[PDB]
Structure formats: structure tokens, C-alpha cells
Amino acid sequence: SKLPDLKDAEAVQKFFLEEIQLGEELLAQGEYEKGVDHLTNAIAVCGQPQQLLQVLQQTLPPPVFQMLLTKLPTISQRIVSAQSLAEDDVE
């Protein structure tokens, strides 16, 4: 592709429906995980009160729960380093 732009289609809705599927099969509890997938498609927008909770609270459940206590700062610090590099690029 040349000069791509952010766009939505039913495919992302159906790929959002496979994230629901991963959550539900992984947790044997569809209702709670359905909320955590709505919390991953809503980071595509990054809504003001819901812009930081999103991807982290998603990356929590799918593997064994409670094994992400240490990896969560790893993801957060790598994101912080990413913004540090972006801030350097802006400067």
C-alpha cells in the first residue's frame, strides 16, 4: 500500500469478535472478557477517561491470570521509553 490511512470496516468488527472468542475460551467466562475486548477496540480511539487503562487491562487476562504482575511494568516502561524517543524526535 502507498500512503495508508486509518480506516474501519466489518473485518475489524469480526477481528474484534475473535478477540472476544480468545477471551471467552481462555477464561471460561464470556461476560467479563467481553468487557475487556470492548476495552481494546476502544483504545483505537483512546477516549479521555479511558485512554490508559485500555490495552493494559486487556493484556492482563488472556494468558494465565496473575502472571502479568511483573510484565505489566515491562510493557508500561517500554511504552514510556517509546514516548521518550518520540519526545526526542519532536525536540
What does this entry list as its resolution, in Å?
13.0
**49 touches 63 (CB < 8 A):** no
Backbone angles phi, psi at 58, to 5 degrees: -70, -45
What are the beta bridge partners of residue 47? 50
CA angle 77, 79, 83 (to 5 degrees): 115
Experimentally, the structure was elucidated by cryo-EM
Q: How far apart are CA 5 and CA 23, in angstroms?
A: 29
Supply the DSSP string of the chain, one letter for each residue: --S------HHHHHHHHHHHHHHHHHHS-HHHHHHHHHHHHTTTTTBTTBSSHHHHHHHSSSSSTTS-TTHHHHHHHHHHHHHHHHHHHH-
